[PDB]
Amino acid sequence: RWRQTWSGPGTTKRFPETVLARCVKYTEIHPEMRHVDCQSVWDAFKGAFISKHPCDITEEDYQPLMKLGTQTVPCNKILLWSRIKDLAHQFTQVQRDMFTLEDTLLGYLADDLTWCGEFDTSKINYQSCPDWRKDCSNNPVSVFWKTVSRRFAEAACDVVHVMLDGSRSKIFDKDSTFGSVEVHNLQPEKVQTLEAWVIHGGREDSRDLCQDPTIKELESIISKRNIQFSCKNIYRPDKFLQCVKNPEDSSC
Numbered sequence: 598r599w600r601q602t603w604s605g606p607g608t609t610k611r612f613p614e615t616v617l618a619r620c621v622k623y624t625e626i627h628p629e630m631r632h633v634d635c636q637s638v639w640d641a642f643k644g645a646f647i648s649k650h651p652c653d654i655t656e657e658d659y660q661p662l663m664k665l666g667t668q669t670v671p672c673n674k675i676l677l678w679s680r681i682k683d684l685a686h687q688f689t690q691v692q693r694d695m696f697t698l699e700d701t702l703l704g705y706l707a708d709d710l711t712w713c714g715e716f717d718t719s720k721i722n723y724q725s726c727p728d729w730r731k732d733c734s735n736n737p738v739s740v741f742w743k744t745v746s747r748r749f750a751e752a753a754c755d756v757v758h759v760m761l762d763g764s765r766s767k768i769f770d771k772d773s774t775f776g777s778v779e780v781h782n783l784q785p786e787k788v789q790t791l792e793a794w795v796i797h798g799g800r801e802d803s804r805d806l807c808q809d810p811t812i813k814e815l816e817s818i819i820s821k822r823n824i825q826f827s828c829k830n831i832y833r834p835d836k837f838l839q840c841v842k843n844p845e846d847s848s849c
C-alpha cells in the first residue's frame with residue numbers, strides 16, 4: 598500500500614520470535630535470571646500493547662512485564678547515556694566496569710526494536726507504528742522506555758555516570774529522554790554524584806566541553822536536586838577504549 602496509518606516504522610520483523618530468543622539467551626548467560634520463564638515474559642510483553650490503541654499506552658500496561666523482569670543491578674555501577682548508546686555499550690563490554698539499561702533483561706529484550714498493535718484486533722502492526730513527534734507520545738515503544746528507564750534511574754546510587762555526545766548541537770538536551778526522565782528519577786537520598794563523560798566527536802584538539810552552556814544547565818539541574826555534578830572530557834573515544842582494554846600498561 599501507498600500510505601500507512603502511522604508516520605513511523607512498523608514492528609521489527611519477526612518481533613515475537615526475536616524477543617523470545619533474546620529472553621532465552623539473556624537468561625542462559627545471566628544466572629541471576631536463569632529461572633525466568635521466557636514464555637511468561639513474552640505473554641506479559643504482548644499483553645502491554647496487543648489489542649490496545651497504540652496512542653493510548655500507559656505505564657500500567659507494562660506492569661506485568663516490569664514485575665517479571667524485576668532484576669538487581671549493582672546500583673553504584675550504573676552508566677546512563679544520551680544519544681551515544683554505541684560507545685556506552687562498547688565500553689561496558691570490555692570488563693563490565695559499568696551496566697547500561699541494555700545490560701538488564703528488559704533493556705536487552707527491546708534494544709533497537711520497534712513494535713505496536715491495533716485497537717480491537719490482536720494483530721501486531723508490521724506496517725507502521727506511531728512516531729513520537731508526528732503521531733503520539735504515548736506509543737508502545739516510548740512508554741516502554743520511559744517506564745523501564747524510570748525504574749533503572751530510581752535504582753542508582755553513589756556515583757552514577759552518563760555518556761553524552763559532545764558532537765551534538767545540545768550536548769545535554771533538557772528535552773531528550775535522558776533529560777526529561779532519567780535525570781528526574783535519580784534519588785537524591787541515594788545518589789551522591791552524577792558524572793558526565795562528554796564524548797568528543799571532533800578529531801584531535803577541541804574545547805573544554807565541560808564548559809558548554811548545556812553542561813552548565815545539567816549541572817544546575819542536578820545541583821538543585823542536592824546531587825553533586827562532575828564532568829570529564831573524553832577527547833578521543835578510540836584512545837579511551839584502548840586504555841580501558843589495556844589500562845596504563847600503555848600511553849594512558
Ligand SMILES: *[C@H]1O[C@H](COP(=O)(O)OP(=O)(O)OC[C@H]2O[C@@H](n3cnc4c(N)ncnc43)[C@H](O)[C@@H]2O)[C@@H](O)[C@@H]1F
Nearest residue numbers: 678679680698708709710738739742746773774775779
Ligand atoms: C532513558 O534515556 C536514555 C535515552 O536518552 P536519549 O537522550 O538518547 O533519548 P532521546 O534521543 O530523546 O530518545 C531516544 C528514544 O529511543 C528509545 N530508546 C531508549 N533506549 C533504546 C534502545 N536501547 N533501543 C531503541 N530505542 C531506545 C526511547 O523511546 C527514547 O525515548 C535511555 O537509556 C532510556 F530510554
